[PDB]
Symmetry: D2
Subunit: 459 residues, 4 copies
């Protein structure tokens, strides 16, 4: 035994699963707005010897020795991160050690806030993420709501865009220490200048979690939150199309004074201390390297053309079913995802997702503003995944037809069934649907296989 044996020779039971997952990725259509297909150059670094190196600390200030090479890789990842988002290395710094998106936000809270300090984020059913501070009415769900006190800001159930009105008044009542301007299911843009002026009034930190729109900000397509926020966290996958990791961007340098006083930003040393030694242990240098590869790809003109494509098909998604029997919350989209309101078409979110999944269309249910209730009303459909397969507008309008067909299968089964347990049932029971779904899935798998796919060929 040497450890250099191939995976296909040593673990065939596993190797069959990697290929089965790779096949299904190429089999169907990925419409989850948070998913994407990583490049072979990044995964080549992800599965490298950099997994073997323990490099606790930071470049130049390690605790072990022998970090000569990983120090240059971390510094290059930092330079490529500041370059990808057009940041002066004197006005901004970046921490590339967060294991994923969730640890990145928890590190920002630990660095700048005390336990049980106040936090305001967009609620989870209103398009927010768990790590933005989510409690139900029974249990504290996210750990961000256990170690800190979180009050959600909602948004106008008629506008579809976040209620910067109600956020302003309640920020003066709740008196938060930090407000998160980030979204997980929101098809429009964020007024970060509005978010900064409410934060400056109640004196709260404005943290931007551009996790979903990271690649779009990098390609300078949509307005960048770095002009208004002081701290920016993000995912390294999603639109950035990299390995699973996180990044914490923080403002650095002099912020502002009598006739003689320099008043510097204090984010850097606190943020870096929260990541290590407070929260995380040994960095995942293989992930940091894979992120640096994906960040370099984000500085290229290819990535701007890819980013400019995720919107035009997001609009093509919005136009294709607005010109069908569907309405969209907020009234379309200005980013990468569409929030199709299946309520005015007599459908629910849990209904369509199970149907679309069985025909190899991966989606997820979303709670639209006028949804009520487990059976939400709306679906979450994204662009960046198929756009990385060289999908164009005509290709996305055809998927909408594949979706519309799947919806009208569910809408036909729903009127022939009752509850959700009977609906998700009859999707696999009724023989009239047992091969109507198979006939569809057949047409859907052949349409999807013909497109290219980033990464390795067989895994």
């Amino acid at each position: 035994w040497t450890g250099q044996e191939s995976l296909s020779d040593s673990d065939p039971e596993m190797w069959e699963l990697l290929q089965r997952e790779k096949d299904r990725q190429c089999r169907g259509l990925e419409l989850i707005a948070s998913e994407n297909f990583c490049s072979r150059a990044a995964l080549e670094a992800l599965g490298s010897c950099l997994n073997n190196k323990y490099s606790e600390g930071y470049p130049g200030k390690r605790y072990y020795g022998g970090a000569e090479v990983v120090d240059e890789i971390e510094l290059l990842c930092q330079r490529r991160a500041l370059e990808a988002f057009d940041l002066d290395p004197a006005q901004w710094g970046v921490n590339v050690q967060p294991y994923s998106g969730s640890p990145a936000n928890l590190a920002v809270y630990t660095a700048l806030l005390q336990p049980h300090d106040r936090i305001m984020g967009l609620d989870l059913p209103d398009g927010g993420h768990l790590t933005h501070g989510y409690m139900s009415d029974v249990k504290r769900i996210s750990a961000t709501s256990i170690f800190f006190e979180s009050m959600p800001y909602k948004l106008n159930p008629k506008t579809g865009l976040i209620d910067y009105n109600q956020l302003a008044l309640t920020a003066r009542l709740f008196r938060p220490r930090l407000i998160i301007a980030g979204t997980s299911a929101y098809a429009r843009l964020i007024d970060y200048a509005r978010m900064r002026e409410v934060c400056d009034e109640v004196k709260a930190h404005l943290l931007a979690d551009m996790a979903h729109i990271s690649g779009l900000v990098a390609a300078k397509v949509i307005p960048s939150p770095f002009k208004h926020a002081d701290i920016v966290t993000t995912t390294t996958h999603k639109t950035l199309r990299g390995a699973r990791s996180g990044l914490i961007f923080y403002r650095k340098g002099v912020k502002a004074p009598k006739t003689g006083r320099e008043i510097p930003y204090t984010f850097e040393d606190r943020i870096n201390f929260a990541v290590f030694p407070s929260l995380q242990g040994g960095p995942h240098n293989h992930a940091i390297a894979a992120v640096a590869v994906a960040l370099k790809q984000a500085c290229t003109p290819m990535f701007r053309e890819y980013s400019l494509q995720v919107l035009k098909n997001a609009r093509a998604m919005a136009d294709a079913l607005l010109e069908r029997g569907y309405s969209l919350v907020s009234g379309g989209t200005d980013n990468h995802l569409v929030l199709v309101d299946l309520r005015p078409k007599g459908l629910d979110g849990a209904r369509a997702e199970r149907v679309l999944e069985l025909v190899s269309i991966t989606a997820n249910k979303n709670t639209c503003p006028g949804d009520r209730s487990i059976t939400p009303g709306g679906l979450r459909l994204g662009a960046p995944a198929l756009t990385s397969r060289q999908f164009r507008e005509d290709d996305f309008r055809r998927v909408v037809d594949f979706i519309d067909e799947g919806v009208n299968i569910g809408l036909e089964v729903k009127s022939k069934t009752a509850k959700l347990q009977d609906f998700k049932s009859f999707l696999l029971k009724d023989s009239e649907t047992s091969q109507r779904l198979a006939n569809l899935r057949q047409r859907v798998e052949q349409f999807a296989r013909a497109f290219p796919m980033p990464g390795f060929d067989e895994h």
Copy 2:
């Protein structure tokens, strides 16, 4: 742009940095006790298309859809995790989603304890890890000391072993809700039975963090903490020789008028997600599953047996050459060397050994508060390169030459950065270290290296 371009073509700047680290690992003597060389089979899974799948939730209980095979992969990782440690699936469950060892420990605290509940682990300078609750006398350092109240227990400096007596004394006063049994720098076997009795007396959960000794535990070469702990966490690298990830083993079934069940499973799984983490790193979960099957093989038992032999051979070689060992020797994978009787501190030795491609780390000795005067040396990394007992005896020879080089420089320097700069500016000390480094690399390059050939 297809996204299928190779790394050497697409990003030549990063491809070379990859190969530079590969050469550094192949040419150096990796003695960091927490480092190992992951197999190529696992790395193939680590850098696969499983990075692309968002599967928030658990097998069968996924929030989204399309996780058909990812559910099979995570379930396979769990089955191999319990098999690797001879665990009854009816008495033990495992969470395979912790991003690393530090998240695994934070998930256990968030699941079982309320904020500011009390935690007891071995003090960091005494051999405990950061995530076992560590505060300095000036600052709360570990987040385990911010969200929870930690009080450390200490070694008996006379013997270098854990002071199980003083732990029992202070646990009755501190009344902790959870006590951590697990070390980062400890050459001896933890008395898990004694820890269990202390936890039973003060009504505390016993958490075993076997991150450093997990591979040894899986190979049944040292006593298993599963026979005494309710919760067991571990890293998946180190002696398990896998990708970087975490595991949380917990008790299941009935604990003990009349059926008091265990209440760990769903609290632990809820703390991992949705409380603390987001999407699981399915590529890491798969690479861990590949490593876990390797841990069930007879090959891994003989390797773990060799790790113990190599550590003792390294320990015996140091003793015969006039070195002091904390706690007198070792019973696991690492060796704690006390360099104070030889005349050099761990800081100076760590820098000298690093410049000759020998990677160790300074280690606090019982007594010092002070610059560290010890050194922690591990066997599992080089043992994966087919090192044997005679090879580690030769490693101690290279270490002994490095110590005396640092000894002669200390006599020619005052402050520590005068010492560090003297190893670079001074022309002799430069070439004297260049000859030792070359002899070290020629000796290390000859041994095989797990993983890919080029990166």
Copy 3:
């Protein structure tokens, strides 16, 4: 030395101060809404041998011995408390050990809530009290806001009455565990049925702090909060006209169930444990006795006539200066105090209070809804103090004339000065005012001395 020597014989320096304070009490007019003049029967018990007894615990469940007599005094205080507010001793219990009003509320929070649990109270500048959870924008002021997380509910700056609208929406955002329906500077009534229905929606405890309107609820004049709240705290002075102490009323017995289930209230054992042994030590049995005396006086027809008088002069206060050059927030009063808005008369709160004090009219500045800012706009004027001196409507309309004269002295000095340091200055500097105030104070002291005064004659 025996300890039985008189105070006038053993401590003449002190004895002179007791008489000086007694003289000034009879000298001037007490218009502080929270103050009152205690009866001689209560103070006789307040300065008794009951100060010597340590009786930690509760009747029947003491920790020491020899509590045979104080147990009957505590039980009688409990019976007289439930009788004074017409409570079924099966539906309500009372804890008579709170040292004062502030400890009473802190005990309720400790009993029912966890540290950093959420609390909603009326803000201090909006008429609330400190113990209702008051933070500034720099420091956490009240300890209730340090050990618990408090978000204030404000009230319509045009209505004058608490904004049950904004309280309802923010209670669904803040998700509090307990909401306090109590006031310190609020001239109108509280819709406790509105307060209960918002508490039932967000599932929060409704605590009523009737500290200011305790005597009015006891005399069954104004609506009682005990019909809507589960926990009621109060002061034993203020309108109850007793010694300084506090009381915690809690609901007791079965609250509600399948076909067989009794679901009891759990307030009693928690509330009693928070008072002792959690927060307080040895009870002040001399205060408990003095409270029981004052509570028995509250069950009498005399107290209803006294209570019915505190409002008619509160209205007479409201009418007298509404029919002068003054406006009142909320538009008058329905309880015992008036909140005179001195803004539309060109006056401030800090201006009039210092002027009225120097002529022996004790008042306090209050922040009216349209006040801005240290120099608030409005004054807090109460009835129960002088009403206990057998004051009637014609007597209160004359004080308003004494007030109006004092205001027009300040309004004349304010136009002759500038800031507050110069205003409070020229009140004692200008000789035209140095005896205009002395001539007034002379007429004010003779008008006030002629009225009776509860308590001892000389101290």
Copy 4:
């Protein structure tokens, strides 16, 4: 209705209850160590018109108006408070607004510590007070254990004294921010210097809670904790013989490149008001000021001297009659009697002594966890009734008869409530206790009683 009616006329039900307690105090032997008989002069101030004045704030810094003389009264109480303890007004300030001793301690924690900061006091069964942080093994009992994290230090059971060594050992591990020096049941003098060194080492505030010994400290008959503590709290009753209220003494001026000042004054005063309390009990503040001037007199020094003599006379009388004393004897105002060697527990003795008008309280002995087997007896209450050494020797005689009555009943009963009921139902034990009670009351009534005659 004028409000000037007497209590005997207005409320005859309460007036009689007042006189019933007065007779119980005059006829009983008050041995509760924390009880004293307040003078009539102070009670006149306690039940005065100062109950009517709301003066939220501090002298000169009042939020309202009309506190002209109340400011003079509070300032006079402060001047007498520092004079009573020989304190330089430039080095010490005092807050006279704490409603009692428990609020005084909570105000110190709220002022100096953040929520969940760490507190160390002597354990309750070992002689510490509730407000020094007390949790059982099942529940946080004291609010000082809810808003802050308390860990107790313990007596050395071999000697009955505070284990200053183990306190130093556990303070280094627990790292408390404030350590409390002060007891409720402790017959010996606290080593405030040793407490100070432990606090200086772990960077903790030393809080001295002298509630039980304040009168002795004021009379300079025992060492003053002000020579070693930064914060000193006390009740105003007990040995100070005043009304029920609290005091917080704190350091002022300069504490120690170059003028590091003390930072207690405004933090302490802010915690009292507006943080914790509302309107001060000016009637209590005045009654306290009357008592504080009494504490500065030569009369109070001779009374405090007699308190020590009476406690030793009580202690010696118990020893000669075959009783055991925790820590061998006493150096202050109380005596801790161990009744386990005699064959009776404190619970049974406390009930028997109560039925014969002898008021003591059961007290845990070092070792027991168990029903208490000891008894705490205090001297300051009866010493205020002009009791002398021979009178306390007679008190021990009455106690000795009560113990043997309880001993014979224990031999005729099984459970504890069988014992308690036997003292009431059984006709002999009833009349045997009636004869002792009558002899106790005839002996006690003869001594003078401070306060009013009738109430």
